[PDB]
């Protein structure tokens, strides 16, 4: 019969392609609740100095967003007082007291100013008296590299996973009596459960230079994806794991990252400080997940659906 | 033929309404992987005091959520010790020593008492002794107010958003050799591609007093909408800027946003710390997207579902 | 006549299960924009020490993460200098200064090697001697439990929400102007609007021991769902609150919630610091939301849907 094979081809067309391929045949739940608990480890050294983790990465409670300091600019013995300006600052340059108003305060000036043109920290320019912490920046500041041994730092991300509605739980780190999570280098393919991640290895899958990204900054995203057919087995609901940078790598404007912090003391009575310019390499932990277990009621409306495009072809 | 005008009706109802207006013909992704990169610029006086970003601006990493302090009730000289209790706890005020019995630990108290009545710390009243951080706030604290120039402060925010599906990104900053990030004011129209906004701006656009929310504290959302379709050129991908206040506003129980927090010292070997209640205005940077690319899957089955109606009418 | 009986068997069908139960004649935004402000209260006492929120919340800005500290690992005086390694660290152990190498550098190690063998911190054994921020915490920390009147800490969260394609905004305090959220005990259903939850019921409702999660530290989360039909009173859309562990509770790998952090002095002019391994309790403030109101035009879309099955059937 010529119907018969007409309606063969047209059945397997709808059926092979509308409930296999997108999968008609399950309800779907898209974003889990996650937790992510990262830790870093790794110490580098700067000119007769030892640095710790204490000290780079910041903020320090372990979340998804923490920040691996690679390089600062560091001002010591910052007190509230009286210092030439910034030559860097609008109208800072004075060469007579008359050129200073007294009272003025840019806010992208670093105090307020005092009416007097002192000599500037370095030679033979003279630049505007401001009130305020002192000295400033851009005329005491010293710089250290601490990104010397960063690709080689280690970074412990840990996940779990939660879709409410199926009532799925999975984690990245498996029941494993040994120690295996202590002698682990993460693969995609031999160790995907041993979630620790070279810094390096993390930067070479963003396709970027350790050295740029170390000296300007940079934001790099680790994405967790859990894409997990209920259906099956948990032992087939794993992490996927992908590496890339967030932040504009061509903007002349504003490349890279940074952010300032200050270390408060009290030296005989006088609260000093000292104010740190941080460059770093900001780590995202970004967690994407879609999972589909069988439910009888989409089932059967898609089935119903496809029954009525047959009828009506 | 009166069923070629009726179809050329039918027809035209479901392509310019179907195919047109809800864009039936594309494949669609909501919500990008964003980076926000924030910094804050301006400084403001309070008596004899000059503050900085580093001060006012907590925490300082430059991220999607941060504090800009506009008040403070700081409290000084703070070490473990003993001191009357705040008169405003339960059971605190005395008239003897019968009346405080030692050991009882207030959880809305400041300490351990001691069993002992002592005069406040402004008569002539008399509170329970307590024994932890002395004094306590309510009876030393300092007010400050210094958001008397947080209007004028400025907000640099940077965002680069990814579509992963479509490989699409976009940044909110331009590639411009010139000085324009430097001397640029943020317009919706002539100047939509320098993101620094100032305070007084987005309280403005959130319609909010800054009076208001600089004394009680607030949050104010900066939502940033990337509704781009990319069957045009990455030209026409723009971000559209949103100011909204997000807490609420007339609730009298809980009005506002604050904080406390602690800078701590080692005077002559003691402990010491400055305790700060922080009132201030919160800023969200929220992102929300949703590209728009043509596939043909989808064309295809929503041409067909198209037929299959017209046929039916 | 039979069709009438078949006709009306098959609407009620497909009436009372299509426009009822699914609300097919509404349109829906998923996802709203939240504010999550935070504030913990309670103070706990150590062996002749109080502790306050500031110094175990961490962070202190009181937002949607923060985390509550139980228990500390802390390590008094630590200088950069020499000192031995811990005990603990690869190839550290010694029995004579040939088994230790100068300059090596091992990143889960603590400092930088001196090519020396000094006695450990506690005899008998031999360790090799390193440069970095001594002395080690594995040699010289000291355990302090904090999480004793933990159960009785209190939690306000206070939420707002808004849906801009509604135009609906809601939060979880009520405009009341007595003190009742001065004097009140979260209950789901007597006291829904007071937002104010201890650590206690929080872990109660979680499903877990306060002794267990106090010890190794773990993560909670608080989730509320705004499921609000816009059709109805605002009186109607209310918060719904859920409590459950988002960490995983069988690995032995890695068993909780850790992070370490210290506290920087300046002692005759030398930078010292106190450094803490903080165990704790991380409270994830997580907002779901779904709101429904009719709209016109997926009313009609459906019931011409609806009408075409009942055509065909
Ligand atoms: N909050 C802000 N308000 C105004 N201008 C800003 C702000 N943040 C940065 N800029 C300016 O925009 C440009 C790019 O920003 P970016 O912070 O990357 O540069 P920078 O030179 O490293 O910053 P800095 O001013 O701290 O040296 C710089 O010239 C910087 O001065
Ligand atoms: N974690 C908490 N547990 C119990 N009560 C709280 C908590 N946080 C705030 N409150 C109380 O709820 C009311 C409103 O909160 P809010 O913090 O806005 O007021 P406040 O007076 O500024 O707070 P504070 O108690 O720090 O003075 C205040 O009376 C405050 O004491
Ligand atoms: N960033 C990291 N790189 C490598 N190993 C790690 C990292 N973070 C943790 N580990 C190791 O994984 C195991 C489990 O992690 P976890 O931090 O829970 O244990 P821990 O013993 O409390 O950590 P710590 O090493 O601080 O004592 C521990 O043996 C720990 O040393
Ligand atoms: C300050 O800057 C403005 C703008 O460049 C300039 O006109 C003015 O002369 C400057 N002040 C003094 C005292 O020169
Ligand atoms: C890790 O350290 C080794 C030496 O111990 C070095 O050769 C290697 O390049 C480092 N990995 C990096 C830089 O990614
Ligand atoms: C403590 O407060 C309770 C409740 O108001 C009160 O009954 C009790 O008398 C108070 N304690 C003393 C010693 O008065
Ligand atoms: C910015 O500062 C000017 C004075 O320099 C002031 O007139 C203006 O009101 C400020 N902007 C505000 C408060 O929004
Ligand atoms: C360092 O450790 C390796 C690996 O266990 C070992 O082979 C080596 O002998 C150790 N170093 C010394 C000096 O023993
Ligand atoms: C709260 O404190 C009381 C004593 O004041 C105690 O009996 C109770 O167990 C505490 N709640 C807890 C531990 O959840």
Redo the contacts between chains.
Sequence with gaps: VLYRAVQLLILLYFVWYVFIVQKSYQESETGP???I?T?V???T?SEH??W????YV??????S?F?IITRVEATHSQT?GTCPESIRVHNATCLSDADCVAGE?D??????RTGRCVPYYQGPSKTCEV???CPVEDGASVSQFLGT?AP???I?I?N?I?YPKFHF?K?N?????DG??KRCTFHEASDLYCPIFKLGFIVEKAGESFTELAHKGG?I?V?INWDCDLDLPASECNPKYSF?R???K?????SG???????????N?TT?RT?IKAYGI?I?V?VHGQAGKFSLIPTIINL?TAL??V??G
Excluded at 58 to 63: D, Q
Excluded at 250 to 254: D, E, G, L, Q, T
Excluded at 257 to 267: D, E, L, P, V, W
């Design positions: 609740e996650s937790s608990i830790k480890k790794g110490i050294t100095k030892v710790d983790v204490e000290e910041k903020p320090p409670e372990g979340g967003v920040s509230q305060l806010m992208l000036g670093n105090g307020l009130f305020g912490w041994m080689n730092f280690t412990l840990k779990s939660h739980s984690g780190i498996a029941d494993r009596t295996y999570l934001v995203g994405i890339r967030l932040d504009p061509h903007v002349p404007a504003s990252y940074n952010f300032r912090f200050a270390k408060y003391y009290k030296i009575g000093t104010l900001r995202d970004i119903a009525t495009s009828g009506v």
